[PDB]
Amino acid sequence: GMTDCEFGYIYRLAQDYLQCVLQIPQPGSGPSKTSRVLQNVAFSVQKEVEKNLKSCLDNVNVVSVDTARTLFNQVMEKEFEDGIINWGRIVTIFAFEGILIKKLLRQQIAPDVDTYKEISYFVAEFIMNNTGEWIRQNGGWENGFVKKFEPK
């Protein structure tokens, strides 16, 4: 409900999206309705950004989780420096973590299967600390995000 702006919920969203990108959907009850809606819109954004920024993205080597974290935080800082938060921008956070995990899969110097869990963690830390209050004031994931992006 309203607690969906807390770290655990956001972490699960970020982890679900990376597992989608990596094609490792996990067994069990399956992703939440929110996560299902997010995966479609974020993937559409991710493919658009991959095409639009292809020349730039091919000139960055994401060789470690620490490089991924620093780059993610650098990019997020500049993306959000104007103080504007909206749902479209929040979607691009997930799209960008999907871009990072794909590069890591190809370029990580010492590959480690738990890496996407570390990416999910620093993504959730950014979303919660920098947009969590806005998310709450705008209905959370269930009453804000899903209402904007679910099928009509």
Binding site: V41, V45, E48, V49, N52, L53, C56, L57, N59, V60, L71, Q74, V75, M76, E77, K78, E79, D82, I84, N86, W87, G88, R89, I90, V91, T92, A95, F96, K148, F149
Partner: peptide, 21 residues
């Protein structure tokens, strides 16, 4: 500069999605 360019592209795509999606 690569950080600035990526951030600006994400911002532009996000603001477009906000206004249309």
């Amino acid at each position: 500069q690569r950080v600035v360019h990526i951030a600006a592209g994400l911002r532009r795509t996000g603001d477009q999605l906000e206004a249309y999606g």
